[PDB]
Design a protein around this ligand. Structure first.
Ligand code: MG
Ligand code: MG
Ligand code: MG
Ligand code: MG
Ligand code: MG
Ligand code: MG
Ligand code: MG
Ligand code: MG
Ligand code: MG
Ligand code: MG
Ligand code: MG
Ligand code: MG
Ligand code: MG
Ligand code: MG
Ligand code: MG
Ligand code: MG
Ligand code: MG
Ligand code: MG
Ligand code: MG
Ligand code: MG
Ligand code: MG
Ligand code: MG
Ligand code: MG
Ligand code: MG
Ligand code: MG
Ligand code: MG
Ligand code: ZN
Lengths: 64, 71
RNA sequence: ACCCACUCGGCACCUUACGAGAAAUCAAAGUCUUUGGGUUCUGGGGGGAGUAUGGUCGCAAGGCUGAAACUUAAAGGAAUUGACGGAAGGGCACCACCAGGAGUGGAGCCUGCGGCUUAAUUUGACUCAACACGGGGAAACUCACCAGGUCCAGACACAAUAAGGAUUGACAGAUUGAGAGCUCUUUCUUGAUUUUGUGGGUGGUGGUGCAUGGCCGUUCUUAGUUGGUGGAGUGAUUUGUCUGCUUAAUUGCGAUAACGAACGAGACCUUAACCUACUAAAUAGUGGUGCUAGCAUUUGCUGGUUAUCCACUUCUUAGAGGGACUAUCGGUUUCAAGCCGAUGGAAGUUUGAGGCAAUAACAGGUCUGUGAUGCCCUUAGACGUUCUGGGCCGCACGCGCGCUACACUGACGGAGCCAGCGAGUCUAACCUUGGCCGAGAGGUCUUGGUAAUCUUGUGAAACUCCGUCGUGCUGGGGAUAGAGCAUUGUAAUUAUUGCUCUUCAACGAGGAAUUCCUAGUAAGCGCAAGUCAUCAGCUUGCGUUGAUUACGUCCCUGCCCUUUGUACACACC
């Protein structure tokens, strides 16, 4: 499916003197900018980076 | 392929004749003009066009074929 | 005789490399541009050629010595990557076998291909990967073929003819298949639009698919391709990308001079399965209520009623979510990826089936899909085009896909009576209900539908029941053939199709061979759609009924992989 989503293709037939040859163009657009669809490959698996914490500290409690 | 066949005699075409034409028109000693070949009563052919003289047969050429006005 | 230590001199092997080398390799092939221990011998691009000639030795065969002219841009070495083999080791698969199913191969016919025949019987394609393929079911059309007949729709440029008319048309007759003015007779008409010539164009189902684009098929039911940092190498390259194990998979585990990634596989998407959870519905449906029919009556049971009212969303529909991750547990395993069993679950074979699909290859197929196309051919007595008629169907015969059968698990007759995927008419005649008429095919009158609204609950077929027939080519079988009716169409003869009576063949389960297939699958059964005026024995899908046997292996066959050889690289054609 990302094919349908992300790659644009086109064939054009350029007609010359000796014969006629074919062009095939294939652009693929950055999924990160999709504006309206999936914003990545179905492949993307981002893991969020954990925060370093300073634990310990014997109990305590704060009033409000 | 093959090329060429035929028992001879190729068809010609049409010549569409010549004629110095518009003589059919008699005009006297200065200078009364009287037509020859009677013209066409069909109001789509304003009486300039004339009928041809065959046997039986007077025929409106301009009426590309049409109408058998015969006397 | 044996054991251990050392020591000379031997035949070799191992490991390293300071070092050498174009490498392969080398304790010499080392101590060489940092170039000298002593000495012998041979080579100086490839062929010509160890040839000619002379000398010499020999019984001979031949040995030793040994040129040139001429020719030629390479010949050659080691190593790398490929491609290939008639070697070797592993695998993978119902287009492979195992175990089986249902068959084809035999027959009648349908249908393609060959062949033959023919005016023509248009043509492409010939192992899997040509032969119910070109969506190829051709009556005209299509159409390319054959017998004939018209037309130019021959742009534009120059030149010529030429308003005393360049050219156009025609009624009747003749002519013609023809109500073609095709051509001719005759004699009107038209008015610068043509006509002649050269040039230049143009169309062409003409050639060339071995000139091409594009598309497709095949290798491929496959699992492969590449780069960063590091390691090896002067270098092309290599390792990563690997013994094993595992998987549908270069899918992973693991091993590890590699580490960590990307393409392709996976993911992804589509469809079929689960939601009494969510949002709803007179174009979907349920319960209640009226109005009402039938049988019972004791309240009951079974129907009718496109809005007489109320309520709901289980069933139907489709939006948004949720669900499964091979979960839990237990076996087995290098307790690794995994695999197996049980429980639970809508679902636990990639959940089942598909769509997508890297790098590369083929002189695969298609110029006959294209106003895609180069070059070639042809272009007015045309290979342009159209019109009339025939032909693709022709029939001693060979091959392929098919349909129907050889009966009693059946045929026939009455009776029950159940799907799913579909499709339908505007400037039109599509899908058709109901009513009549008809034995039937069909007809006729109306009608609903641009459609979850109507056809249609598509009341489909196998199948189910009660009968009849009774193993006899029988009432199995229904080829061939006569006679009649009717539909599509301008046209039905060489019989489009449909109905009816009759006629009643081969075929008594099929030699050698060979095809397909593992679960809602095989097989049986019909349907819708494509084609389509009419014509399905074909195809694409669909649902109905519903098994037997594996859950394996490498024996056959096909492929893939390493190893290995190469003088191949236009790569064994
Ligand atoms: Mg040369
Ligand atoms: Mg078998
Ligand atoms: Mg058999
Ligand atoms: Mg014709
Ligand atoms: Mg010309
Ligand atoms: Mg010319
Ligand atoms: Mg053409
Ligand atoms: Mg080709
Ligand atoms: Mg091609
Ligand atoms: Mg050819
Ligand atoms: Mg298979
Ligand atoms: Mg280096
Ligand atoms: Mg490799
Ligand atoms: Mg529901
Ligand atoms: Mg269970
Ligand atoms: Mg070829
Ligand atoms: Mg083409
Ligand atoms: Mg044919
Ligand atoms: Mg076939
Ligand atoms: Mg009757
Ligand atoms: Mg109406
Ligand atoms: Mg009989
Ligand atoms: Mg019968
Ligand atoms: Mg049909
Ligand atoms: Mg067909
Ligand atoms: Mg090699
Ligand atoms: Zn007139």
């Amino acid at each position: 499916q990302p094919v349908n989503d992300f790659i644009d293709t086109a064939t054009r037939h350029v007609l010359m003197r000796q014969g006629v040859l074919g062009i095939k163009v294939k652009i693929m657009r950055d999924p990160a900018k999709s504006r309206t669809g999936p914003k990545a490959l179905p492949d993307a698996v981002t893991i969020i980076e954990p925060k370093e914490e300073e634990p310990i500290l014997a109990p305590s409690v704060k009033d409000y | 392929k093959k090329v060429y066949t035929t028992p001879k005699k190729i068809k010609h075409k049409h010549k569409k004749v010549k004629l110095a034409v518009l003589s059919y028109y008699k005009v006297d000693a200065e200078g009364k003009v009287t037509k020859l070949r009677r013209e066409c009563s069909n109001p789509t052919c304003g009486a300039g066009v004339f009928l041809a003289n065959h046997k039986d047969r007077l025929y409106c050429g301009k009426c590309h074929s049409v109408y058998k006005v015969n006397a």
